Amino acid sequence: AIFRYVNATLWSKAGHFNKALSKGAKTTTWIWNLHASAHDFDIQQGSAGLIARKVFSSGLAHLSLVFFWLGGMHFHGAYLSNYSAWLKDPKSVAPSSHIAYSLVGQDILNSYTSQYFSGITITSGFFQLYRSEGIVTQSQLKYACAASLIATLICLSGSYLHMQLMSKFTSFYKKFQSLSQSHLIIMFGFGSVSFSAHQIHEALPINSLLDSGIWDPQLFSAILLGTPSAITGKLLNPSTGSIFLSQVAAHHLAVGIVFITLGLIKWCNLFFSRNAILSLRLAYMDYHAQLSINLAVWASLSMVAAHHLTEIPVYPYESTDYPTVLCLFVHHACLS
Amino acid sequence: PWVGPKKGSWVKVLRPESYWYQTRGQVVNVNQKPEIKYPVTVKFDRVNFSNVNTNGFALWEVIEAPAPGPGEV
Numbered sequence A: 001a002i003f004r005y006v007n008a009t010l011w012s013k014a015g016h017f018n019k020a021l022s023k024g025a026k027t028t029t030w031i032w033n034l035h036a037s038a039h040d041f042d043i044q045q046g047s048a049g050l051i052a053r054k055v056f057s058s059g060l061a062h063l064s065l066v067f068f069w070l071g072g073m074h075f076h077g078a079y080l081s082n083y084s085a086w087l088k089d090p091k092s093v094a095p096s097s098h099i100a101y102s103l104v105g106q107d108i109l110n111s112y113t114s115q116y117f118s119g120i121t122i123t124s125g126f127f128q129l130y131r132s133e134g135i136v137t138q139s140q141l142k143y144a145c146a147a148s149l150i151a152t153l154i155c156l157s158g159s160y161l162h163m164q165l166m167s168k169f170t171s172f173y174k175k176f177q178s179l180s181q182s183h184l185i186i187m188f189g190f191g192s193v194s195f196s197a198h199q200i201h202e203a204l205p206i207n208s209l210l211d212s213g214i215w216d217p218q219l220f221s222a223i224l225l226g227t228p229s230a231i232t233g234k235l236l237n238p239s240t241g242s243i244f245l246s247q248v249a250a251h252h253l254a255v256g257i258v259f260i261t262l263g264l265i266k267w268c269n270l271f272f273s274r275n276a277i278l279s280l281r282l283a284y285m286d287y288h289a290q291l292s293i294n295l296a297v298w299a300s301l302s303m304v305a306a307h308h309l310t311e312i313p314v315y316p317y318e319s320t321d322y323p324t325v326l327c328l329f330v331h332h333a334c335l336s
Numbered sequence B: 001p002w003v004g005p006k007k008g009s010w011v012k013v014l015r016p017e018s019y020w021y022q023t024r025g026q027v028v029n030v031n032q033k034p035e036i037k038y039p040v041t042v043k044f045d046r047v048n049f050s051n052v053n054t055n056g057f058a059l060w061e062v063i064e065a066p067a068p069g070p071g072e073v
């Protein structure tokens, strides 16, 4: 709460955090140790409250970094991309929101993607992601970029503030029951329900019109309209080669309902075998225990994502965009 | 009387295995006890590999030298 103690005086000390670096710069090993132990908040000067402060604020700062990266992706799609040509005819035009300079003959890197566009073919599937989300206009992409930048600023402000809002008495990060319940019910359950709502209300009409061939502004600005009784996944969009987005929206609604139900039964204590996990509950209330468990969980989820993004097609035209599917699989396997 | 070099004076280290061999340090102190094999104490601004700044030398392992100049060790 007291922000008079945040001054740039420590910026030039370069090693204040580690007590072992007090005898500044007697060798280059000092520089290397400074870098190595920069983010090892546990062994740094201070207290457990300060460790929690640093952990949470750094998480928020990294959140802001990721939001900045996403906003940059959206901006490149909006202004430095052939997304218009790709949307009208995905097959002929390869996705490209990446352009290189002509410095030293470096213009050779840009390759023919469309009649009026030359650049580097992207393999992140961002065009397919936009199409699934229903983004079909430069204005929509621009506002997505603006939202990402605003989120970046908000997260940066949150990190800076929480570096001082949280005091030595702060304990909200130790409330594991509250943390897990909130994440399960709101972040996951309500999040999935809200995204199903978004799909149903925005993406479904736009995607249906795009499949039909309609590109009318008034239409761009009746669920289950085209989906037959065939099981989801057993029948792909003949004109898009992907699972029906209405089926995807129903999936997200069901997943959100299931997550909310799980959270509510946990709230009511319906789950009974607490003792089988009580030993782990007592042992693994640690920063590194939680970090390890979460890293393994996200590694496994990344591997499952790598497999499913290819085996089960859900994004428009990503199935036929062979570089995109391959790169997605490989990237997520490596992250796993 | 003072057996070794004066306190604070610069002495060039003549111990071949010393990290500061042939370079100069400052005489921190000298042990006047005749039973000390390595009485002289010399400190150097350059820490050795073990991050040690000072060492003990015998009267025959240090000679008097002028203070280092600019760019001299």
Ligand code: CLA
Pocket: A035, A036, A037, A038, A039, A040, A041, A291
């Ligand atoms: C949520 C993610 C997360 C978090 C919060 C932490 C947190 C921590 N880790 Mg890390 N860690 C992570 C992921 C994470 N880790 C992963 C994914 C691995 C597996 C590789 C590790 C493996 C690991 C080890 C083995 C160790 C840590 C340690 C640490 C501590 C600080 C390390 C430090 O100061 O590095 C500072 C150094 C850097 C930030 C520079 C790293 C740069 C590398 C080489 C990557 C370069 C990538 C780049 C893009 C290359 C291409 C570019 C080029 C073409 C120019 C801290 C507790 C250390 C510790 O003792 O903790 C107690 C420690 O020894 N971590």
Ligand code: CLA
Pocket: A073, A076, A097, A098, A120, A121, A122, A123, A124, A126
């Ligand atoms: C100045 C160099 C430069 C810059 C600034 C960018 C910037 C960008 N590229 Mg990349 N790109 C480059 C060179 C560059 N590229 C080159 C030379 C190629 C080959 C033609 C590509 C091919 C390429 C593709 C195909 C795509 C991008 C994309 C992107 C965006 C991804 C965000 C990002 O980088 O996150 C940070 C990411 C990292 C730091 C990755 C680190 C780990 C990588 C994956 C390891 C792989 C090997 C590595 C590249 C080389 C190692 C050996 C080397 C040291 C000799 C961003 C605008 C994607 C996009 O969506 O663009 C809009 C995209 O789809 N780029």
Ligand code: CLA
Pocket: A173, A174, A175, A176, A177, A179, A180, A181, A183, A184, A280, A281, A282, A284, A285, A286, A287, A290, A293, A294, A297
């Ligand atoms: C070993 C089995 C196991 C498995 C498979 C999972 C799986 C999961 N857990 Mg985890 N969890 C486990 C054990 C396990 N957990 C144990 C033993 C505990 C505590 C006893 C927890 C506590 C826990 C919480 C509190 C949360 C999860 C969540 C999650 C999800 C992944 C991470 C995430 O979303 O991060 C997002 C959340 C964060 C990044 C917050 C990280 C937690 C804080 C910041 C750590 C604080 C450490 C502490 C203060 C250190 C003090 C040390 C000092 C006193 C000595 C996923 C459902 C999250 C979720 O959404 O669940 C539904 C979630 O919020 N787990």
Ligand SMILES: CC1=C(/C=C/C(C)=C/C=C/C(C)=C/C=C/C=C(C)/C=C/C=C(C)/C=C/C2=C(C)CCCC2(C)C)C(C)(C)CCC1
Pocket: A070, A186, A187, A190, A191, A192, A194, A195
């Ligand atoms: C980036 C990226 C990614 C992705 C991510 C994501 C996309 C996530 C998700 C996210 C999300 C998507 C989230 C969500 C959220 C949501 C929410 C959080 C909601 C909530 C709700 C609420 C809060 C409610 C409120 C209310 C109202 C509305 C009013 C009144 C009533 C009530 C109160 C209820 C990954 C991982 C791949 C990694 C890489 C890249």
